[PDB]
A paper describes a structure:
The S. pyogenes Cell Envelope Proteinase (SpyCEP) is a highly conserved surface-exposed serine protease that cleaves and inactivates all ELR+ chemokines (containing the N-terminal glutamate leucine arginine motif), notably CXCL8, mediating evasion of immune system clearance strategies and systemic dissemination. SpyCEP is a 180 kDa heterodimer made of two non-covalently linked polypeptides derived from the full-length protein by an intramolecular autocatalytic processing event. The N- and C-terminal fragments are 30 and 150 kDa respectively, and both contribute residues to the catalytic triad (D151 from the N-terminal fragment, H279 and S617 from the C-terminal fragment). Inactivation of the SpyCEP protease activity by amino acid substitution of the residues constituting its catalytic triad should result in a safer single polypeptide vaccine antigen.
Extensive screening using crystals suitable for X-ray diffraction ultimately yielded a novel structure of the full-length ectodomain harbouring the double mutation in the active site, SpyCEP(D151A, S617A), at 2.2 Å resolution, a notable improvement on the resolution of the three previously reported structures. The domain architecture of the SpyCEP(D151A, S617A) mutant matches that observed in the published SpyCEP structures, as expected, with nine distinct folded domains (D1–D9). SpyCEP is significantly larger than the C5a peptidase and has an additional four domains (D6:T1147-K1286; D7:K1287-K1396; D8:D1397-M1489; D9:L1490-A1578) before the linkage to the cell wall. Surprisingly, the two C-terminal domains (D8 and D9) in SpyCEP coil back on the structure and contact the protease domain, an interaction that might retain this distal protease domain proximal to the cell wall. Furthermore, three tightly bound calcium ions present within the interfacial regions of D4–D7 also appear to stabilise the overall architecture of SpyCEP. However, electron density was only observed for residues 116–1574 of the ectodomain (MW ~160 kDa) in all SpyCEP crystal structures, with residues 34–115 and 1575–1613 remaining uncharacterized. Significant structural differences exist between the two double mutants, and these localise to the PA domain and a neighbouring ß-hairpin that supports the relative positions of the PA and protease domains. This region is completely disordered in SpyCEP (H279A, S617A) as native contacts between the catalytic H279 and Q613 at the base of the ß-hairpin are removed by mutation of the histidine to alanine. In light of this, refinement of our SpyCEP structure by using the PA domain and the rest of the protein as separate search models for molecular replacement gave significant improvements in electron density maps over using the whole SpyCEP structure, and a shift in its relative position was observed compared to the published structures. In molecular dynamics the greatest mobility is observed for the PA domain.
Numbering used by the authors: 118 to 213, 273 to 459, 465 to 476, 486 to 508, 510 to 527, 539 to 1125, 1131 to 1203, 1207 to 1266, ...
Write the structure that this text describes.
């Protein structure tokens, strides 16, 4: 009578086994944290509310009051609680086939669907736990805060507090660590486990390292991408397998209805990125078979001719393009007029004649072409710190579940596999509460997981016929019946359902424990299967399939009733070492399963445990791919490097480990107003515009910089292809002579951490540039390091405790000296210009010499290029080069230009350019003197000041900041006799403080913080040779000696029997523009801005409109300067500005500009300020060094939010008393210092309120205690906090002598308690630094009583 239950998944995962025992999920609650839900769906129902946890709306209201939750609502007997956490509302339904799509709804159907009504297959669809209640937390990623981790934490805490049994979380970041995830998220998950809550999370959908590019290289075995928080020990990580059955629109051939091997005449068909089958049919067609692709079309796929040329041929001959595969048994290809592909076997019988064809509109069941195969995108292990994740597998590919408005659809992902496990966890919890009632809250989540893992069914790849890797499937495929029928689970030393062995040498030895929850003894027979990765011998890449090595018999073991037994598994793996070390030279995985079964019958008591070890040193595998310079000299190739283009082309957008720098062209006719962007260090532009890694006379490349301020090769920064997650990355400089790298001359002020360049899709980068590692040729004290041979060293660590520090050394030259131009000969007979043989002044060496003249185009020797897309202006010399002859001479074309109009240019490998204009020394070869015309030089700031007695002597820069154009505006020097405030942002306006009929000697400029009254320690000081003539030597740009920007605040700038002290405030906070007022007098509009110490004071106001010219809001004029098309409006005597109508100017074209005392500029559209009514007020909320709720005078939250000047943190409100409550903020990166609740009153007198939440920023560090020898049995290592708390440290998995943790920045002490007879020698104290790794080397010293 009632429709049949679809069992496509249920027969596979064995759900009936628990359902028959009475475990359907009644009395349980599942919290689904997802995108959206339709709580009205026919599936969202329970059979009996008498046995349910939340019996009514009143029961939930009581739960809310007791939990302190004054939001969210009960919806029905199934959806007992819902809230939208992003928007803070009860708008829980999404997307209000694509029309009804809802990820969250799909997910909810899988765990707890309970439809009474039949879907399109004629079957009703049920979830794993159909009688369970649902809690729905609507949380998702948004532009304002991408992670939304803080909202997911609050949702987790709510679910636990309101009474959930299981939580299904889709949140995730690839390559998760087990022991170093975010502190508030890991704490929230740990409080859930303590409450008896199972936390179920998808593994992710990124496959392995390089999945969007190619298979990983056999030399790079750390390719795991399993995501965080699933990589946490507490959550259950879920991998996905493809369903054996698919429900979709198929293709029917009624004559082939008698073929049960061909799904009774129904076929699966595929299309490319563009779908055009709608234009062909909806819901009969005669087809015709073709044998040749030469002169509906039924055709066999051709390996020679493309899909395009097969389709085109069918159009020319006459209906449709039904392409059938040439490979038997193969799934349909992605093909990338109407066309579609389908199976070979299906068309071997379609091919036999001519007849019927019909594309069905309604979905139908079909066996999957890729069924019982691990999903291609399912995330593999290991964990970034080397633990075995994921934990288990469940069907996630082609899952048919609930969509909006009683609809249904198919979706693929670990996100569909996750609710299978969430549902199963509800049934196992219900089973343990009945059968093990004394098992406490705090222990139940670990046992639910252990039963599901041990009773899981081990997958065998149906193609290779080999056991799927534990790193891909985990413990195996979900078996619900086994987890509720057997009373058995398997554990290792750690008390977990899987074993992570650490490093392997010649032997694998581990202890396996079987637990019996039943009243009778069980005799099990066991064997262990050993596997490794299969490598393609032709490509030297991992195939991501396994190789079975050996099966070891273990014999029989008896597991006592209500008890446990422990066995030892020993395996000598040395016999395989030679063969496998050849294939995988940097080490390889040794993994598999210990399989237990009943000694009497094969079918009963099938329980198992996955294990994984690494043969080698997992902790010391390369973090960064070898440099492009080193790869090129060995003839090797990088994983992501594009080898196309000319020989040795290293275009900077390519993906490699190397050094980058900024280029700036040298012009001869005008000044350079723009740089050329970044380029690869050691590469130079050829005649075709391509950057080539050029060689010196010795055939080696040269890495050299010229830090002289001309913006051409001034610095060198690290760029890397990261193979593994890294931490504590920094750059350091040494003398080339300092081979041991003992005396650092300069260290990057900051340290870095980040992800491996996994490149799962186009959004994930294949390489990372770290501009923070830039070396500009200055020491730690900011002194100029002299020209010479240095070593630029990039050091970093893997995310594995005990790993050795890794480093990449680059030989680098500092050379600030232009090459030598002296003499040349010129032969009037042949026009031969012969310069003196090439010589460089410095160590870099001359790379190229050239000759050019200036081509006059449009009566100018230069070209002004206007890039409207970036609103940028470029100016370039029209350089026309003369060919260099084999003997190094040049034949000057005198018809093109006169002898005196030729330039001779010499450039070194460091970026130093010498240019001589032939003709500066002009009135058979005639001798000709050459000198550089100083064309390449550091720009100099306009100094047209005269210092009078009244002046303080303090100088600064001034520049008009742009609204439209992106060119660096003209800046000039100005006096600072008032408003001693600076904005160190290098925009040309008040960026620094400097000192200018007198004479000064021993000039000494020093800067000290506010409280340094005794002048004890300067933060910055001037460099040896400071003069009143050169303002650069005394200019302080709001930085430390190490080059870091000083924090906002006041400072002592003191010039030195004379000592001139001056207090300078630093602030780059943009001014906050208020709405002002608008009035219409005699038809003409009027704008009256609001009248305004602390650097927020306004020094100048502007009102203007941007007059559009030549399709742009900016103009370029020949001095060459770039300007905005600003038409100014004068201030009226009362204080207003007349916004008089102009023939083509609107209010959105008008602006109000303000400059503060610090030189920070803000501007706003007049139409934006006008959006606030004459009666309304504005409030702004911010953090100073998130989600908020505003309530009216009554206490009712505000509705119909009105946003001011395009800010989601600025609200337009009527007058009245209000309250603001800070609800969430990232507790991981920030700490709140002020009140969460703020009262503010908006009125006519106070029509603009600023409300700030004072926050302190948080940083992390890594501490590792590394010992001499292994610590004796009984030793405890912990870290002592400044607040007297002890953090227990555990022996690292890969480095047993090391103990470490990722901690918040602060002071710590390594505490060690040893048995009698030992002492620890060495420092235990550490003052940790941001993103830094602190290694503590300690000695275990034997001791005796005196
Ligand atoms: Ca330079
Ligand atoms: Ca040089
Ligand atoms: Ca500035």
């Amino acid at each position: 009578s009632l429709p049949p239950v679809n069992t496509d998944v249920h027969d596979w995962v064995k759900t009936k086994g628990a359902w028959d025992k009475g475990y359907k999920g009644q009395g349980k609650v599942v919290a689904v944290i997802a995108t959206g839900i339709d709580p009205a769906h026919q599936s969202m129902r329970i059979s009996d509310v008498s046995t349910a946890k939340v019996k009514s709306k009143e029961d939930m209201l009581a739960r809310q009051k007791a939990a302190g939750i004054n939001y969210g609502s009960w919806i029905n007997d199934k959806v007992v609680f819902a809230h939208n956490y992003v928007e803070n509302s009860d708008n829980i339904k999404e997307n209000q086939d694509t029309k009804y799509e809802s990820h969250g709804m799909h997910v909810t159907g899988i765990v707890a669907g309970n439809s009474k009504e039949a879907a399109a297959t004629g079957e009703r669809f049920l979830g794993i736990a159909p009688e369970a209640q649902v809690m729905f937390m609507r949380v998702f990623a948004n532009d304002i805060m991408g992670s939304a981790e803080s909202l997911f934490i609050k949702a987790i805490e709510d679910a636990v507090a309101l009474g959930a049994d299981v939580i299904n979380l889709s949140l995730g970041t690839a390559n998760g660590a087990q022991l170093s995830g975010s502190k508030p998220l890991m704490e929230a998950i740990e409080k859930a486990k303590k409450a008896g809550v199972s936390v179920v999370v998808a593994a992710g959908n990124e496959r392995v390292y390089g999945s969007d590019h190619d298979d990983p290289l056999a030399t790079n075995p750390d390719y795991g991408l399993v995501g965080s928080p699933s990589t946490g020990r507490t959550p259950t990580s879920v991998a996905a397998i493809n369903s054996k059955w698919v429900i979709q629109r198929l293709m029917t051939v009624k004559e082939l209805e008698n073929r049960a091997d061909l799904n009774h005449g129904k076929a699966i068909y595929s299309e490319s990125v563009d779908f055009k089958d709608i234009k062909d049919s909806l819901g009969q067609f005669a087809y015709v078979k073709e044998s040749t692709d030469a002169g509906i079309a039924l055709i066999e796929r051709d390996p020679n001719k493309t899909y395009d040329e097969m389709i085109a041929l069918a159009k020319k001959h006459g209906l449709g393009v039904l392409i059938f595969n040439n490979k038997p048994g193969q799934s349909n290809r992605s093909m990338r007029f109407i066309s579609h592909e389908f199976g070979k076997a299906m068309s071997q019988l379609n091919g036999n004649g001519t007849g019927s064809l019909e594309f069905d509109s309604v979905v139908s069941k079909a066996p999957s072409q890729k069924g019982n195969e691990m999903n291609h995108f399912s995330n593999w292990g290991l964990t970034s710190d080397g633990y075995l994740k994921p934990d288990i597998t469940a069907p996630g590919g082609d899952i048919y579940s609930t969509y909006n408005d009683n609809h249904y659809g198919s979706q693929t992902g670990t996100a569909m596999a996750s609710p299978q496990i969430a549902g199963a966890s509800l049934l196992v919890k219900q089973y343990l509460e009945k059968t093990q009632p004394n098992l406490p809250k705090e222990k139940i989540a670990d046992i639910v997981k252990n039963l599901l893992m041990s009773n899981a069914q081990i997958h065998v790849n149906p193609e290779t016929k080999t056991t799927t890797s534990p790193r891909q499937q985990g413990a195996g495929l979900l078996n619900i019946d086994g987890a509720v029928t057997s009373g058995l689970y398997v554990t290792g030393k750690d008390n977990y359902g899987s074993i992570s062995l650490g490093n392997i040498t010649d032997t694998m030895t581990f202890d396996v424990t079987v637990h019996n929850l039943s009243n009778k003894d069980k005799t099990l027979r066991y064997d262990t299967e050993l596997l490794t990765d299969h490598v393609d011998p032709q490509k030297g890449r991992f195939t991501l399939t396994s190789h079975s090595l050996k099966t070891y018999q273990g014999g029989e073991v008896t597991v006592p009733a209500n008890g446990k037994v422990t066995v030892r598994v020993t395996m000598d793996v040395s016999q395989f070492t030679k063969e496998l070390t050849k294939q995988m030279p940097n080490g390889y995985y040794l993994e598999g399963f210990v399989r237990f079964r009943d000694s009497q019958d094969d079918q009963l008591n099938r329980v198992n445990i996955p294990f994984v070890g690494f043969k080698g040193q997992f902790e010391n595998l390369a973090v960064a791919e070898e440099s492009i310079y080193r790869l090129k000299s060995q003839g090797k190739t990088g994983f992501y490097f594009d080898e196309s283009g000319p020989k040795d082309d290293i275009y900077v957008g390519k993906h490699f480990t190397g050094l980058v720098t900024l280029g700036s062209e040298t012009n001869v006719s005008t000044k350079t107003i723009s740089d050329n962007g970044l380029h690869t260090l050691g590469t130079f532009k050829n005649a075709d515009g391509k950057f080539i890694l050029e060689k010196n006379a010795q055939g080696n490349p040269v890495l050299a910089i010229s830090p002289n301020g001309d913006n051409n090769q001034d610095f060198a920064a690290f760029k890397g292809v990261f193979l593994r997650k890294y931490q504590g990355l920094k750059a350091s400089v040494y003398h080339a002579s300092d081979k041991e790298h003992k005396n650092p001359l300069w260290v990057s002020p900051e340290s870095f951490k980040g992800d491996k360049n996994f490149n799962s899709d186009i959004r994930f980068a294949k390489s990372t540039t770290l501009l923070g590692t830039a070396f500009s040729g200055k020491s730690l004290t900011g002194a100029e390091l002299p020209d010479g041979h240095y070593h630029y060293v990039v050091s970093y660590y893997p995310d594995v405790v005990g790993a050795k520090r890794q480093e990449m050394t680059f030989d680098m030259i500092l050379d600030r000296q232009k090459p030598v131009l002296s003499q040349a000969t010129f032969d009037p007979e042949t026009n031969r210009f012969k310069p003196e043989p090439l010589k460089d002044r410095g160590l870099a060496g001359v790379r190229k010499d050239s000759v050019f003249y200036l081509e006059r185009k449009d009566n100018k020797p230069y070209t002004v290029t206007i890039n409207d897309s970036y609103k940028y202006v470029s100016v370039e010399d029209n350089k026309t080069f003369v060919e260099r002859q084999a003997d190094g001479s040049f034949i000057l074309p005198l018809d093109k230009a006169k002898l005196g109009d030729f330039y001779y240019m010499v450039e070194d490998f460091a970026g130093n350019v010498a240019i001589a204009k032939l003709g500066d020394h002009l009135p058979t070869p005639i001798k000709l003197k050459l000198t550089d015309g100083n064309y390449q030089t550091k720009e100099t700031l306009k100094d047209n000041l005269e210092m009078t007695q009244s002046d303080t002597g303090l100088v600064t820069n001034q520049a008009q900041l742009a609204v439209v154009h992106r060119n660096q505006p003209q800046s000039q020097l100005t006096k600072m006799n008032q408003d001693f405030f600076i904005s160190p942002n290098e925009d040309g306006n008040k960026d620094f403080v400097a000192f200018k009929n007198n004479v000064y000697n021993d000039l000494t400029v020093n800067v000290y913080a506010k409280d340094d009254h005794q002048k004890q320690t300067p933060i910055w000081s001037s460099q040896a040779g400071a003069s009143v003539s050169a303002i650069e030597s005394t200019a302080w740009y709001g930085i430390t000696a190490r080059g870091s920007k000083v924090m906002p605040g006041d400072y002592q700038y003191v010039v030195t029997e004379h000592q001139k002290q001056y207090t300078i405030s630093v602030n780059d906070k943009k001014p906050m523009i208020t709405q002002g007022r608008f009035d219409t007098i005699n038809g003409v509009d009027h704008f009256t801005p609001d009248k305004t110490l602390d650097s927020s004071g306004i020094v100048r106001e502007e009102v203007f409109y941007l007059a559009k010219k030549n399709g742009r809001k900016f103009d370029v004029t020949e001095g060459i300067t770039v300007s905005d098309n600003k038409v100014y409006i004068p201030k009226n005597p009362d204080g207003s500005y007349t916004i008089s109508k102009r023939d083509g100017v609107t209010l959105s074209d008008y602006y109000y500009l303000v400059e503060d005392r610090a030189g920070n500029v803000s501007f706003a559209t007049l139409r934006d300020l006008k959006a606030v009514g004459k009666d309304k007020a504005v409030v702004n909320f911010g953090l100073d060094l998130f989600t908020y709720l505003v309530r009216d005078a009554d206490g009712k939250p505000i509705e119909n939010l009105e946003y001011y000047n395009n800010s989601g943190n600025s609200l337009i409100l009527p007058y009245g008393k209000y309250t603001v409550e800070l609800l969430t903020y990232d507790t991981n990166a920030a700490k709140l210092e002020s009140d969460k609740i703020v009262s503010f009153t908006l009125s006519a007198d106070n029509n603009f309120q600023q409300v700030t939440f004072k926050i302190t920023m948080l940083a992390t560090s890594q501490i590792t205690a590394h010992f001499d020898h292994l610590l004796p049995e009984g030793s405890r290592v912990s870290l002592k906090t400044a607040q007297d708390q002890l953090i227990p440290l555990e022996q690292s998995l890969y480095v047993p002598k090391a103990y470490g943790k990722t901690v918040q920045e602060g002071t710590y002490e390594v505490v060690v308690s040893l048995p009698k007879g030992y002492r620890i020698e060495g420092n235990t104290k550490v003052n940790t630094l941001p993103n830094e790794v602190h290694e503590l080397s300690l000695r275990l010293v034997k001791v005796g009583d005196a």
